[PDB]
Amino acid sequence: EVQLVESGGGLVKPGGSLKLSCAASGFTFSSYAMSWVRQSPEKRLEWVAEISSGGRYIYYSDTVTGRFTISRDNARNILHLEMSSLRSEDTAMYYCARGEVRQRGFDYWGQGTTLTVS
Amino acid sequence: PPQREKWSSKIDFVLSVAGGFVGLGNVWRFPYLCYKNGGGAFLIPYFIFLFGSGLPVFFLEIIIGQYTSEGGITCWEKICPLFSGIGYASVVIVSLLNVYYIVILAWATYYLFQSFQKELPWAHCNHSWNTPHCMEDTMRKNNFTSPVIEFWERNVLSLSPGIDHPGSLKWDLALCLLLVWLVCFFCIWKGVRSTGKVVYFTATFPFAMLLVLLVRGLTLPGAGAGIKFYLYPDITRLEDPQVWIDAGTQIFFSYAICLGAMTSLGSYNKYKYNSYRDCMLLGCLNSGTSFVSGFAIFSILGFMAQEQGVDIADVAESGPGLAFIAYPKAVTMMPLPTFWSILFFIMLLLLGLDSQFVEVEGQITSLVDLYPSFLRKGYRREIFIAFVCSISYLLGLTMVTEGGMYVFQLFDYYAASGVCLLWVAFFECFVIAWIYGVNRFSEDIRDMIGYRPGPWMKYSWAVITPVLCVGCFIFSLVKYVPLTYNKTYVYPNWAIGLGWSLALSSMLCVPLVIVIRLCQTEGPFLVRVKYLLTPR
Amino acid sequence: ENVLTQSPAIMSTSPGEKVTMTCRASSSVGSSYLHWYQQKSGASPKLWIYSTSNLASGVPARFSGSGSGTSYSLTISSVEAEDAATYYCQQFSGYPLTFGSGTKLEMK
Ligand SMILES: [Cl-]
Ligand code: NA
Ligand code: NA
């Protein structure tokens, strides 16, 4: 049973930092690329950051292009998302999505972590 | 230096492989390798190498080109710089292949020019080049040799009775070879490639003519015995190592594997281009072309065996002139045989010319990827085109002499389609699978195609292709039988040594480059290896 | 970015009636890279239609997808009460990945 459990949801100050933790289970985490997708309170989905199967190909959206860091820990089968300079327009609902096949898409999602900036 | 260009269209890559690795190795080489190795028993290692090694290393080579955006040699400086000698090995293999492949097209052009008169010269025994043993094919059943065999052996080849006697240079074949090299030079140095014309006439008419030959071969009487020879295998023949290595190198020959040609054609792909479905569809096209042309030519051979009253394995040449015996013999039973002969040898010229353009382009692309800012675009690169063509022509003149057929069989068995192909394919798969990593290369492939290669490609680069290449190599060595032309000629020791010299000059580019790079870099040997395994 | 302008979010249709929703792309999606996601009320999204034609696991046969290049559409043959959710199209081709806007399917 493929299960993605996100962690690290909480309130931070503007300009602060936070570190989410998508803990994957039930499958080999090393063989699937992982993406962080956030959902605004206006329910507008936006892809945030994708890391590849082994962590050498890392892609960012233009809203987080120089202040977000995404990493894996293939030993512990857990995914990260390091945030920096968190502005007001970054309050969202963060999902980790197992996006490995580009022609299959984000086939397995997980729970959520409410990031609140105030 | 100018940046490396990409393909102008998606179909420019597809039409460059479909004319590139679908050529004379399908309509000419697979027939006599199947014929020489018993017919039915050849297909089992053929399909084993086709699925375990052929399509995997074909897609691997194209996708190595697509990742690195480099051709042949410098593609290995971004995967494993220690094993950059795979690229030079590929360049040596493709150079020797260019030489004897253009010799094949010289024979096809000589048949084309000899087809222009109103009576095909391989149809009757009335010519100066025949023997008193010449009996017509219909009169065989009513030590006798057919007119097609003596035409091929005594007018085209003018076959001396050994490689020790080269005889004299055949100016007929020499001028034919010069004409085909001028055609190859005019289609590379101009850079035409017939972009507005290869969509229909190049892409379909060879396959349309192959379908015509299929329809002709299946309607000949006695074609069922030839197809039974083609398909029904002898398991006792599989115990001999020549079937396995001949089928494996025919797979690695048909696909332009261990040449740098498919890396070079993949190097012009866009980065985010899905090469997997194109590689699979075009590999099915290549293997289907070989298997269909095998059906056609072995139906013709079964007819020839029925007509001449001789066994199927003994009716024609068990050597590199099968497509110039059986196919012209089938041409002599088509309505208006002169026109169909002209169309057939235009077919062989088109197939071999498209190949020779593609692998000459791959060799040039590799050798200009080595040196940017020297062979930039012209006035120095254009001279080097003519230099490569002239040296390959002059090396091709050794197969034009009266004993040059033996030099051809030497080149064909050894220089570019033997243990050298197994060597370089094993080293490609070993490097990618273990020194680069199946998972690291699969991550690259997902980054640029979209998905990781499955347990077919991953385990084929990891286990299946290395175990097939190592097993066939050591099985040919531990049960060695020497090269024989047409099952009767025994090659001398110097000729076998020359063939092994060609094969090892293909092989020894890998250990020479490994030793050169382990001697150039400074430090202890473990540090030198660990520096040269890291991609750049 | 490849901004995917989708159909307006507020659409309200009776159950059992054939509905559709379009997804216009600013760039050209390769038609094997545009996927559709169904996100219910208060839950996480899940993959619904991938490569704009195929149906994901757990997706009923009443759902379908069509279109290529620029215009892409999701189509339900007969809407049930469990189809009330928000649907996002998403090109998964260009490395700045973009989801489409909301298209909220509600009952009457
Ligand atoms: Cl073949
Ligand atoms: Na060809
Ligand atoms: Na071929």
PDB file of N, CA and C and ligand atoms in Angstrom, chain B residues 25-26 30 46 250-251 254-255 286-287 290, ligand 1:
ATOM      1  N   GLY B  25      22.619  -4.756 -44.495  1.00  0.00           N
ATOM      2  CA  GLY B  25      22.716  -5.794 -43.486  1.00  0.00           C
ATOM      3  C   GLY B  25      21.446  -6.588 -43.285  1.00  0.00           C
ATOM      4  N   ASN B  26      20.342  -6.153 -43.887  1.00  0.00           N
ATOM      5  CA  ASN B  26      19.050  -6.817 -43.832  1.00  0.00           C
ATOM      6  C   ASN B  26      18.764  -7.618 -45.092  1.00  0.00           C
ATOM      7  N   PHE B  30      22.086 -10.616 -43.502  1.00  0.00           N
ATOM      8  CA  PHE B  30      21.224 -11.599 -42.853  1.00  0.00           C
ATOM      9  C   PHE B  30      20.882 -12.795 -43.741  1.00  0.00           C
ATOM     10  N   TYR B  46      19.509 -15.227 -33.274  1.00  0.00           N
ATOM     11  CA  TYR B  46      19.115 -13.956 -33.871  1.00  0.00           C
ATOM     12  C   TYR B  46      18.093 -13.246 -32.999  1.00  0.00           C
ATOM     13  N   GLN B 250      25.265 -10.140 -36.379  1.00  0.00           N
ATOM     14  CA  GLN B 250      24.316  -9.665 -37.379  1.00  0.00           C
ATOM     15  C   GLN B 250      23.290  -8.732 -36.750  1.00  0.00           C
ATOM     16  N   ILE B 251      22.863  -9.033 -35.522  1.00  0.00           N
ATOM     17  CA  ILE B 251      22.017  -8.109 -34.767  1.00  0.00           C
ATOM     18  C   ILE B 251      22.750  -6.800 -34.492  1.00  0.00           C
ATOM     19  N   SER B 254      23.121  -4.963 -38.125  1.00  0.00           N
ATOM     20  CA  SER B 254      21.912  -4.387 -38.707  1.00  0.00           C
ATOM     21  C   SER B 254      21.549  -3.086 -38.016  1.00  0.00           C
ATOM     22  N   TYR B 255      21.281  -3.157 -36.722  1.00  0.00           N
ATOM     23  CA  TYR B 255      21.349  -1.973 -35.885  1.00  0.00           C
ATOM     24  C   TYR B 255      22.777  -1.459 -35.905  1.00  0.00           C
ATOM     25  N   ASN B 286      13.406  -2.646 -38.648  1.00  0.00           N
ATOM     26  CA  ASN B 286      14.659  -3.258 -39.090  1.00  0.00           C
ATOM     27  C   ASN B 286      14.599  -4.781 -39.032  1.00  0.00           C
ATOM     28  N   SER B 287      14.169  -5.331 -37.894  1.00  0.00           N
ATOM     29  CA  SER B 287      14.117  -6.780 -37.754  1.00  0.00           C
ATOM     30  C   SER B 287      13.059  -7.391 -38.665  1.00  0.00           C
ATOM     31  N   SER B 290      14.581  -7.475 -42.183  1.00  0.00           N
ATOM     32  CA  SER B 290      15.485  -8.615 -42.307  1.00  0.00           C
ATOM     33  C   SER B 290      14.718  -9.922 -42.436  1.00  0.00           C
TER      34      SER B 290
HETATM   35 CL    CL D   1      19.215  -8.297 -39.246  1.00  0.00          CL
END
